[PDB]
Design a protein around this nucleic acid. Structure first.
Ligand SMILES: Nc1ncnc2c1ncn2[C@@H]1O[C@H](COP(=O)(O)OP(=O)(O)O)[C@@H](O)[C@H]1O
Ligand code: BEF
Ligand SMILES: [Mg+2]
Lengths: 66, 605, 289, 15
DNA sequence: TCTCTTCCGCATCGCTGTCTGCGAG
DNA sequence: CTCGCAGACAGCGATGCGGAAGAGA
C-alpha cells in the first residue's frame, strides 16, 4: 500500500513515548499508521503540530524552571 | 518597585551613580540584594563585611550576590558591628549609594540587640535586661506573660516554653541575647579539656571561633563551613576554650564515634572523660565531662529503656557550658528541636555546612540556637587547598525503551523505582566504578532507594551500608574502606549522606536521590570534599557523578538539587555519553537481562 | 575623525533600535521598507510598525562588521531589482574602501551612518570607519547569570532576547540565562551558536584570562536547550509497505536511490519512505511495471 | 600521571 | 537449667512531594 | 469565575525499643 504522512526520527526512549500516546489515544485518534524502526516512526501529517506540543509538554515536565 | 519592559527591576529613580564607582565594588539595590565584584582590589574586605551583614545568595567566581535580611543584620550586630559602622562601610563600598529604604532598614534591625538577655543560672531560666521599659513591653504581650513561671530586672520563665519565648521575642523586635560568660562562671566546675599544641587551626577555623569568641563571652550561634572543612576541630576548639562540660550531638552512631575520635585527636582530654550516649553502647554517661550523643537518642519521644532512661535523667538534671549541635539543619524538625529544651545548655554552638531546607523552618535556627556566626566560602577554601577540588558532573543515562514504556504510563508512585533501576544507569555506574577503580580511586556510591542500593551492591559485589546494618558492621565497612586496599568502593544510603569523614574518597557516584533535596546533594558531595594527602589545589582531586535518567522526573529533580552547589560556584558538567562503555563487559548488555530486571522492578511495586 | 566613529555607531545603533521593538528609534519609510525587502523584516500592514522576522533576530546578534556586510550585500542585490545598476554603486563602495543613482545611494549610506557630509549634504563627503568595510562588557557566571556593564538600551535589548532581565543599573544589568528564555529565543529563530558567539565576543575582560572564557557548562547547557527542541526530526514523506515482490523491492530501492528521492529505508522490513516531490515519479515507475 | 577522563576533560555535547 | 548475643516486628519520626480544601482579584 | 496558598497525607527510609530465638556455660 501507499501511505502519505510524516516520518519522525527520535531516540528509542522518545519512540516509546510516541507509541504510548498512540495506544492511549491521548490525541483522540491513532496517529501512528505503521511503525518503521526502533528509531523512526510514520504518523499522519494532520496531527504532527499537535503532537509536537505534546512532546514539548513532556520536556517541560522533565525540566525545572529557574 | 518599578519594572522595565523586560520584567526587570528598574532601580535608577531609586539610587544615583557615584563618581569613582570603578574603585567601589558594591551594588546595593533597594530590594536589599547586594552584588559584589569578586575581581575588585578591595574584594577581600568587602567579602568579610558582606558575609557578616548579609547571608550569601550566590557566590560564583566573578560576581557574588548577597541579600540583606533582619536575621543577617541581627547577626552583624551580635559579632560587634554597629548600625553606624554598618551603614558607613556599606555606603563607602556602595558604588551607587545606599537607598533610603535600605538605610532605614539597617537601622531598624540594629536597635534591638542587647536590650533583652536570657540567662541560665542554677537550673532556672531568667529573662534579664537593664532597661525596665522593654521588659514591661514584653510583659504586655499575652504569650510572653503566658510562658512566665507560675537597675536590672529579670523574671523567671519555664524551660518548656523557651522556644515559644524566644520565637515571640523575635516577633517583638527584642531578640534574646543568648551569650555565655564562661570566664566569669565559677558555679560550674571547669573541665580538663585542653587544645594540644599539635593542633594548628586553619585561617577560617580561627576566624569562625573569633566571631564566636569575639568578646570575653561565648556567643551562641551557627558556624557554617564547607563539608570536610574541619567543623569538628571548631567544635573541639570551642569546647577547649569554654573549658566547661560539653554536650555534642551528632547525627548518627558513626558521627559520635568520629566526634569522639576528633576530641582525642585534637584535645588532651583522656578517654575516660569522653563518653558516648548511643543505643549501641555507652561509656558510663553518668560520669563524663564531654558527652557525645545523637538527636535520635535524646530526641526520642516514646518511653525509653531503663538503661537509656537513667542517662536521660542525668542529662536533664545537668548544666552544660557548651552544647555543640552537629548538622544544625535537622534541628528545626518537630522533635529534634525539643532536644534543645530537654538539655539545659549555656552556649549552643551550631555546626553545619548546608544551611538549607525544602521548608521554611531553616530560619528557626535564629531563635533556636542563634545568629549565623560565620560562613566560609567554598571556592576560597577550594583554591587555598583546604578542601578538595571537585569536578561535579551529571551523567545522562538514556532511559531503556522497555523500562520507559512502563514509566510513561505508570504514575502510581512506581516511577521512582522504575527510573532508579534503569539498566542504562546501572551500566554507567558499573563502568565508572571499573574505570576509577583502575585509577586507584576510592569510590562512594550513594543510593537513597534501598532496593536500588542492594541491587547494585550485590550485582557489583561491593559492601553496602543502610538502615538495618548494625553500627559495628557499618563501622567495620568504613574502616576497611579507609585502610583495606582491596575495598575500594562502598555503597551508602541516606544514612551516610552526612558526617561520614572519608578523607581519601576521591570519587562519588549518585544513582538514587530523595526529591530535589539541595541539602542532600550538597551533603553527599561533602564525603569526597576532604583535603587529600598529596592534593594539589588546581588539579581536580575529587570527582562527583550524579547519574540521572533522561526524559524522566529525575532530570527535574537533578536541577532542583543542584541549586545549592551552583550557588557555591560549582558547575555541573553534563555527560551525555561515556567513551569506552562499548568496549567494556558491563551487565544488562542483552535484552533478556533487561527484561528480567523490569519484571523484578514491577513486582517490587 | 574621532566624531565620525561616534556618528557611525550612533546612526547604526538607532537602525538596530528600530529593528527591535524600541519606541525610540529613527523613523524613515525608505529605511523601513528597505529592511522589509532585505529579508530580515516584514510589515504586512503599512499603518502598524513592522515586526522582526526569524532572520531579523539572527541579524541582530551578529557582530557589527558582519552585521553591516550582510545588510550591504542585501542592498546590492535589491539595487538591481529597484532599478539601480549594481556596478555604479559597487564602484562607489570600492572607492570608499580605498548622478541621481549616486545621490540616492549616498543618501542611504548617510542614513546607515557610514558617510557624513557635515556641510548640509555638500559635494564633499567624509566616510566613517565602517565605510571602508570593542571591549566586552558581559560577565557570565556558572549559575546562568549574566552581568552586562551596559548603558545602552540596544545591548540590553539584544541580551534580553535570550535571557531574563532581573535588575537594571546604569553600569550593570543582571540577567539570567534560563531554559525558557533560551528556548523562546531559539523558537524566535536564534541559534545556540549565535548566542554563545554573541556572549563570547562581548566578554568582560575579567573573563578573558580564564580559558575557555565562557564556562563550558553555560555554553554546553545552551546547546542542550537548543538540541531539546529538535529532539524529533519531522520529515514529510510517502511510505511504501506490503512489498510482496521482495526481489523487485531492491530494484525499486535502487531506482529510488538513483533518482535521489529515497529518504529512509529498512531492508529488514522491506519498506522505504520517499519525499512527495518524487512520489509521482516512483508511482509512475511502479505503474509502468 | 593519572590524567582526567575524556568525558570530564572535554565536552561530550554534539553541538 | 540461666545469660549473652542476633534477628524480627511496633511504633515513632525526618524529609520530601503531592494533594484537596481554603482564601484572594 | 480564575488563580494562588497551605497545612495534611502519603511515600520512603531510618532509629529506638521490645520480644523471641540461638549459642555459650
Ligand atoms: N586544622 C587542621 N589540621 C589538620 N587536619 C585538620 C584540620 N582541620 C580539619 N582537619 C581534618 O579534616 C577532616 C575534617 O573532618 P570533619 O571535622 O568531620 O569535617 P566537617 O565536620 O567540616 O565535615 C578530618 O580528617 C580532620 O582531622
Ligand atoms: F560537614 Be561534614 F561532612 F560533617
Ligand atoms: Mg562534621
Amino acid at each position: 500500500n501507499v501511505l502519505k504522512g510524516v516520518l519522525i526520527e527520535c531516540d528509542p526512549a522518545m519512540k516509546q513515548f510516541l507509541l504510548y500516546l498512540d495506544e492511549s489515544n491521548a490525541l483522540g485518534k491513532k496517529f501512528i499508521i505503521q511503525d518503521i524502526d526502533d528509531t523512526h516512526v510514520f504518523v499522519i501529517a494532520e496531527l504532527v503540530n499537535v503532537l509536537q506540543e505534546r512532546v514539548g509538554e513532556l520536556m517541560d515536565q522533565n525540566a525545572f524552571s529557574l | 518597585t518599578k519594572v522595565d519592559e523586560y520584567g526587570a527591576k528598574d532601580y535608577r529613580l531609586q539610587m544615583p551613580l557615584k563618581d569613582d564607582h570603578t574603585s567601589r565594588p558594591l551594588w546595593v539595590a533597594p530590594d536589599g540584594h547586594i552584588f559584589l565584584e569578586a575581581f575588585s582590589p578591595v574584594y577581600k574586605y568587602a567579602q568579610d563585611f558582606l558575609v557578616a551583614i548579609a547571608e550569601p545568595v550566590c557566590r560564583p567566581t566573578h560576581v557574588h550576590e548577597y541579600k540583606l535580611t533582619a536575621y543577617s543584620l541581627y547577626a552583624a550586630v551580635s559579632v560587634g558591628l554597629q548600625t553606624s559602622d554598618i551603614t558607613e562601610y556599606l555606603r563607602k563600598l556602595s558604588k551607587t549609594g545606599v537607598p533610603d529604604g535600605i538605610m532605614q532598614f539597617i537601622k531598624l534591625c540594629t536597635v534591638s540587640y542587647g536590650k533583652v538577655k536570657l540567662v541560665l543560672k542554677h537550673n532556672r531560666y531568667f529573662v534579664e535586661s537593664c532597661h525596665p521599659d522593654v521588659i514591661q513591653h514584653l510583659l504586655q504581650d499575652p504569650v510572653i506573660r503566658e510562658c512566665r513561671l507560675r537597675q536590672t530586672v529579670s523574671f523567671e520563665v519555664k524551660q518548656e516554653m523557651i522556644e515559644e519565648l524566644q520565637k515571640r521575642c523575635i516577633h517583638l523586635e527584642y531578640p534574646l541575647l543568648a551569650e555565655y560568660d564562661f570566664r566569669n562562671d565559677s558555679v560550674n566546675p571547669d573541665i580538663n579539656i585542653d587544645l594540644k599544641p599539635t593542633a594548628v587551626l586553619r585561617p577560617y577555623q580561627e576566624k569562625s571561633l573569633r566571631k564566636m569568641f569575639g568578646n570575653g563571652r561565648a556567643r551562641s550561634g551557627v558556624i557554617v563551613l564547607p563539608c570536610g572543612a574541619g567543623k569538628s576541630l571548631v567544635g573541639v576548639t570551642a569546647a577547649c576554650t569554654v573549658r566547661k562540660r560539653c554536650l555534642v550531638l551528632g547525627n548518627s552512631a558513626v558521627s559520635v564515634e568520629q566526634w569522639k575520635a576528633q576530641f582525642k585527636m585534637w584535645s588532651t582530654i583522656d578517654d575516660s572523660q569522653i563518653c558516648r550516649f548511643t543505643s549501641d553502647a555507652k561509656d558510663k554517661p553518668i560520669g563524663c565531662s564531654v558527652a557525645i550523643s545523637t538527636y535520635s537518642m535524646l530526641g526520642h519521644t516514646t518511653k525509653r529503656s531503663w538503661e537509656a532512661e537513667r542517662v536521660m535523667e542525668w542529662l536533664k538534671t545537668q548544666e552544660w557550658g557548651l552544647m555543640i549541635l552537629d548538622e544544625v539543619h535537622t534541628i528545626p524538625a518537630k522533635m529534634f528541636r525539643r532536644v534543645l529544651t530537654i538539655v539545659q545548655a549555656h552556649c549552643k554552638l551550631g555546626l553545619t555546612a548546608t544551611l538549607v531546607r525544602e521548608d521554611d523552618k531553616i530560619v528557626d535556627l535564629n531563635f533556636l540556637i542563634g545568629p549565623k556566626l560565620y560562613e566560609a566560602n567554598w571556592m576560597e577554601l577550594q583554591n587555598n587547598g583546604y578542601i578538595a577540588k571537585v569536578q561535579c558532573a551529571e551523567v545522562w543515562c538514556p532511559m531503556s525503551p522497555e523500562f520507559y514504556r512502563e514509566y510513561v504510563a505508570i504514575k502510581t508512585k512506581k516511577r521512582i523505582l522504575l527510573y532508579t533501576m534503569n539498566p542504562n544507569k546501572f551500566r554507567a555506574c558499573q563502568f565508572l566504578i571499573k574505570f576509577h577503580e583502575r585509577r586507584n580511586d576510592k569510590i562512594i556510591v550513594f543510593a537513597d532507594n534501598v532496593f536500588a542500593l542492594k541491587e547494585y551492591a550485590i550485582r557489583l559485589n561491593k559492601p553496602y551500608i543502610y538502615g538495618p546494618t548494625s553500627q559495628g558492621e557499618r563501622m567495620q565497612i568504613l574502616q576497611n574502606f579507609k585502610h583495606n586496599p582491596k575495598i575500594n568502593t562502598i555503597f551508602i544510603s541516606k544514612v551516610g549522606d552526612t558526617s561520614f569523614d572519608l578523607p581519601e574518597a576521591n570519587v562519588l557516584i549518585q544513582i538514587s536521590s530523595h526529591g530535589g533535596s539541595r541539602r542532600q546533594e550538597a551533603q553527599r558531595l561533602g564525603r569526597v570534599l576532604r583535603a587529600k594527602k598529596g592534593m594539589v589545589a588546581e588539579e581536580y582531586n575529587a570527582f562527583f557523578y550524579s547519574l540521572v535518567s533522561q526524559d524522566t522526573q529525575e532530570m527535574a529533580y537533578s536541577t532542583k538539587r543542584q541549586r545549592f552547589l551552583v550557588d557555591q560556584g560549582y558547575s555541573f558538567k553534563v555527560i551525555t555519553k561515556l567513551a569506552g562503555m562499548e568496549e567494556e563487559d558491563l551487565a544488562f548488555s542483552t535484552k533478556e537481562e533487561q527484561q528480567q530486571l523490569l519484571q523484578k522492578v514491577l513486582a517490587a511495586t | 575623525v574621532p566624531s565620525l566613529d561616534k556618528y557611525a555607531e550612533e546612526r547604526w545603533e538607532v537602525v538596530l533600535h528600530f529593528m527591535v521593538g524600541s519606541p525610540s528609534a529613527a523613523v524613515s519609510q525608505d529605511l523601513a521598507q528597505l529592511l522589509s525587502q532585505a529579508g530580515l523584516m516584514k510589515s504586512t500592514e503599512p499603518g502598524e510598525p513592522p515586526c522582526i522576522t526569524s532572520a531579523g533576530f539572527q541579524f541582530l546578534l551578529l557582530d557589527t562588521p558582519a552585521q553591516l556586510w550582510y545588510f550591504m550585500l542585501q542592498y546590492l542585490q535589491t539595487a538591481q531589482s529597484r532599478g539601480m545598476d549594481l556596478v555604479e554603486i559597487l564602484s562607489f563602495l570600492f572607492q570608499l574602501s580605498f548622478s541621481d543613482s549616486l545621490l540616492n545611494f549616498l543618501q542611504h549610506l548617510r542614513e546607515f551612518g557610514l558617510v557624513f557630509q557635515r556641510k548640509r549634504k555638500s559635494r564633499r563627503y567624509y566616510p566613517t570607519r565602517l565605510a571602508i568595510n570593542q571591549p566586552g562588557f558581559i560577565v557570565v557566571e556558572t549559575n546562568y547569570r549574566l552581568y552586562a556593564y551596559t548603558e545602552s538600551e540596544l545591548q540590553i535589548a539584544l541580551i534580553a532576547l535570550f535571557s531574563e532581565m532581573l535588575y537594571r543599573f546604569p553600569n550593570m544589568v543582571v540577567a539570567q540565562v534560563t531554559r525558557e528564555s533560551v528556548q523562546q529565543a531559539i523558537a524566535s529563530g536564534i541559534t545556540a551558536q549565535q548566542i554563545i558567539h554573541f556572549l563570547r565576543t562581548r566578554a568582560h575582560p575579567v573573563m578573558l584570562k580564564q580559558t575557555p572564557v565562557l564556562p563550558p557548562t553555560i555554553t554546553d547547557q545552551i546547546r542542550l536547550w537548543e538540541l531539546e527542541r529538535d529532539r524529533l526530526r519531522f520529515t514529510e514523506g510517502v511510505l511504501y509497505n506490503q512489498f510482496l515482490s521482495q526481489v523487485d523491492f531492491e530494484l525499486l530501492l535502487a531506482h529510488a536511490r538513483e533518482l535521489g528521492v529515497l529518504v529512509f529505508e529498512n531492508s529488514a522490513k522491506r519498506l522505504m519512505v520517499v519525499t512527495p516531490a518524487g512520489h509521482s515519479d516512483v508511482k509512475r515507475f511502479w505503474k509502468r511495471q | 600521571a593519572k590524567e582526567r577522563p575524556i568525558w570530564l576533560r572535554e565536552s561530550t555535547v554534539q553541538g
